[PDB]
Symmetry: C3
């Protein structure tokens, strides 16, 4: 999968090791090999949630297959938990958008998937 986090929480508060932990945990959760997992964190952002500048996060999980009701709930729980634990962002100020990418619509290594 591809996972992206945008947040108003500053650079300093992003623990070293956090990108690795997202890669590890996302492999463990999705049933996907970690070699192709991409993770992206953007701190120091001018954003708001409900109008308020209290810590928040706008996130994105792109996957080729394996997206739906029950799975997206378990990923939400895992990643909210991780953002709360590591960046002190409350779960109710996190949004995670899930996308099921069709294989031909994902470019990689001078071509596309499958």
């Amino acid at each position: 999968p591809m996972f992206i986090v945008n947040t108003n929480v500053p650079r300093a508060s992003v623990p070293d090791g956090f990108l690795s932990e997202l890669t590890q945990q996302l492999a463990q959760a999705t049933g996907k090999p970690p070699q192709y997992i991409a993770v992206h964190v953007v701190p120091d952002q001018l954003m708001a949630f409900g109008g308020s500048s209290e810590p928040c996060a706008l996130c994105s999980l792109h996957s080729i297959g394996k997206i739906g009701g029950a799975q997206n709930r378990s990923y939400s729980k895992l990643l909210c938990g991780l953002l709360a634990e590591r960046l002190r962002i409350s779960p109710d100020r996190v949004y995670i958008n899930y996308y099921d990418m069709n294989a031909a619509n994902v470019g990689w290594n001078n071509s596309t998937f499958a």
Copy 2:
């Protein structure tokens, strides 16, 4: 609703309270509870529109329902106007990608909206 603005307009040009303004106008325009309205502004971007460096913006508005023909026309007029008045970006150098997210694909507060 989630609204994101990326622009080559510098940090200094974004007026104080712009995020709240976007949150008020989006709450009106969509009829949605204000607590669910997220906004994000990214200034100083290395962007071009038509190959030119002139002020421009690339935006997106994600929502669970309330996305379609007339609504999007109206959102575009509202939002381009706000970007013209506040950021001094000509409407013809603005894109806003609209997305109608299914409830099961939007994570929040340790779960999804399903």
Copy 3:
């Protein structure tokens, strides 16, 4: 179309005129009018690909209508070729997500397309 590059390659490693080259090349590959081609490059990002933080890119290319595997493979090679040659990014560490936007869900110039 709209092309967006996010990378951990620094600001300085991005050559001058790279946005015009991307605009040039996208116009000649796709046949689309250059005036509506939007490009966005975001250097110095905190990201990892396959657990590792060697130079990488997570990209997107949005078009109105008409997406297929033949075109996407050609765009992938073209775009991967430009990132190798100019940004020193190995093609096996580049994702490009393709999207077929409906005309009505792309806001522009106070209205939407078609």
